[PDB]
Design a protein around this ligand. Structure first.
Ligand SMILES: Cc1cc2nc3c(=O)[nH]c(=O)nc-3n(C[C@H](O)[C@H](O)[C@H](O)COP(=O)(O)O)c2cc1C
Ligand SMILES: Cc1cc2nc3c(=O)[nH]c(=O)nc-3n(C[C@H](O)[C@H](O)[C@H](O)COP(=O)(O)O)c2cc1C
Ligand SMILES: O=C(O)c1cc(=O)[nH]c(=O)[nH]1
Ligand SMILES: O=C(O)c1cc(=O)[nH]c(=O)[nH]1
Ligand SMILES: [Br-]
Ligand SMILES: [Br-]
Ligand SMILES: [Br-]
Ligand SMILES: [Br-]
Ligand SMILES: [Br-]
Ligand SMILES: [Br-]
Lengths: 313, 312
């Protein structure tokens, strides 16, 4: 029996990691992720400079998930690079860093700085093209021309295998158009589906007021809200992008939901909202639960069922 | 108290079915008319009868619904006859949803509707957001295609109508959509929103998708879509001040209808909850919305419509 995953020139102990932005901003966040049972971890979407973010309250927990408009609060790219260079214990697990320039030029500058550290330590890049929460900066992945520009220039500047955090799509034509762009770039080795459902609105009936301050209450949705959307996107790209891996992100609170992500095509499985609710102890539970479901169904490895979701067509 | 006075009509309350739920057959429409609902709307129809997609094509879920019906309907002639000859307009006003799979089909259909709207007052909701027909993507996600539909239908129908919009998730798309809509004055109402398109639900017991069409991909409704619906309602409420907004998505109770109205909704549509519960839900919804209004001291809907507070 094995929850192991062998991809991207690394052996992962299990397919679980945090979703970018959850429990990965500070050194202590990252130390707690490394101490956890997670197979990996990813740093907060960083910017070239430290960034303070949107006004609070900017996160609100809901019965069916979460809404956030954090606005990319982070320590700046140099902090994450130094963590990856010196601090992170790579004998424990591999490390991803998320990078989210608000422009091509900023993302290019950060990925240039990452190059020697990836060469030195094997630090993996996830490029965020789906932040829904910075006022005036719409999700890059919803503009295919802009997406193409990012992928070209980052491919050129970084020159190493990297991944992309995609926004959810809801239109078959858009799965097709997105895949075509992505398939034009061989250094994109993984596709993370998905970021939050952008620009939802939650209102408190008692005070008749939105629950978050930024953008008149409009925020990204995660948790139970996004599971069917996340699975559709993982499978859509799994089917269209034959020479890329897909990482599943959205709605994972258990081994059984992790199992569904893997069935849909997911290599790794990212946990956001549930981890925010529960803390890093969640990873021990998730391993146990996924192992148990496999045992019940007679599966011994993840690749015995990855992408094996059954259709009736 | 719950009354709504819009579009040349008085409605007893803001509630109606969502297009496609309990509104395909004459018996469906009879039961909607007999219900406590303020209005009702016909199934999105096509010029010819449609059998729709293979089964299973609806699956009910703890947090809502997934569907890929494929516009199964009795054909435009039936809905037009229902509107001209059968429907009791003393009970409540009637909407018809039209969902031509091309502009040419939509133009043909709305032309037939003209005399019936003039004589009986039947209201058009033009469906621009079906996510369930293969090779025919949501028109509302292409602002060029959307402008052409709106132009040719404006010319062909020439009377006040509304549009069923897909949900948008990008402020840039709120801005673009509203700008396209604001170029057509005959568009008097905007229904936000249609199902969240092309989600995928898989049963872990059998490792199998739950609906047959399109490898399991269908539209999501119910509890999944409430924040998306509320956001879309309010986005268009703010961007289209000379139009009305209908709310649709995630309404299972008076509290959720209150939120839709607070976000900007004039009428409130009920899909999934109604599929679950049946037309008796409308009597519950009227009672719950009243209870919330009395607790807050509102005597009318316009005392709070669109008055959601923000902190910025
Ligand atoms: C508090 C908060 C902060 C987040 N920050 C980031 C971010 O830095 N970069 C990113 O790609 N996604 C970010 N996300 C989105 C998550 O990575 C994930 O895509 C989303 O929450 C869906 O997963 P979930 O259902 O497990 O929450 C954030 C989510 C939340 C809840
Ligand atoms: C069974 C099914 C059939 C539907 N058919 C139509 C349709 O004919 N036309 C339309 O505009 N919307 C149709 N819808 C979408 C609903 O009208 C509504 O926009 C969506 O389900 C979200 O509302 P809800 O959360 O109350 O279900 C259908 C939905 C379902 C559940
Ligand atoms: O920092 C954030 O606001 C943030 C970034 C992102 O990519 N996704 C998200 O939900 N929030
Ligand atoms: O008939 C359908 O499949 C259908 C049409 C529509 O507009 N929305 C929906 O959810 N289903
Ligand atoms: Br914007
Ligand atoms: Br579609
Ligand atoms: Br089991
Ligand atoms: Br009017
Ligand atoms: Br299509
Ligand atoms: Br959108």
């Amino acid at each position: 029996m094995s929850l192991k995953v062998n991809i991207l020139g690394h052996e992962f102990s299990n397919p679980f990691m945090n979703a970018a932005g959850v429990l990965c901003t500070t050194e202590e966040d990252l130390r707690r992720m490394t101490e956890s049972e997670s197979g990996s971890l990813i740093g907060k979407s960083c910017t070239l400079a430290p960034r303070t973010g949107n006004p609070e309250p900017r996160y609100f927990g809901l019965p069916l998930g979460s809404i956030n408009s954090m606005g990319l609060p982070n320590l700046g790219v140099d902090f994450y690079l130094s963590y990856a260079a010196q601090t992170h214990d790579y004998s424990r697990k591999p490390l991803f860093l998320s990078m989210s320039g608000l422009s091509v030029e900023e993302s290019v500058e950060m990925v240039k700085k990452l190059v020697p550290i990836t060469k030195e330590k094997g630090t993996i890049l996830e490029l965020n093209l789906s932040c829904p929460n910075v006022p005036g900066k719409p999700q890059v992945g919803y503009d295919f021309d802009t997406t193409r520009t990012y992928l070209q220039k980052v491919s050129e500047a970084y020159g190493l295998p990297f991944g992309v955090k995609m926004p959810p799509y809801f239109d078959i034509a858009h799965f097709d158009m997105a895949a075509a762009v992505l398939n034009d770039f061989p250094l994109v080795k993984f596709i993370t589906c998905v970021n939050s459902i952008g620009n939802g609105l939650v209102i408190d009936p008692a005070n008749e007021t939105v629950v978050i301050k930024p953008k008149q209450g409009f925020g990204g949705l995660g948790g139970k809200y996004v599971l069917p959307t996340a699975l559709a996107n993982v499978n859509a790209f799994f089917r269209r992008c034959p020479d890329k891996l897909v990482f599943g992100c959205g709605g994972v609170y258990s081994g059984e939901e992790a199992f569904l992500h893997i069935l849909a095509g997911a290599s790794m499985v990212q946990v956001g909202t549930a981890l925010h609710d529960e803390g890093p102890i969640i990873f021990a539970r998730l391993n146990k639960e996924l192992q148990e479901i496999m045992t019940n169904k007679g599966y011994k490895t993840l690749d015995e069922f990855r992408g094996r979701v059954k259709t009736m067509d």
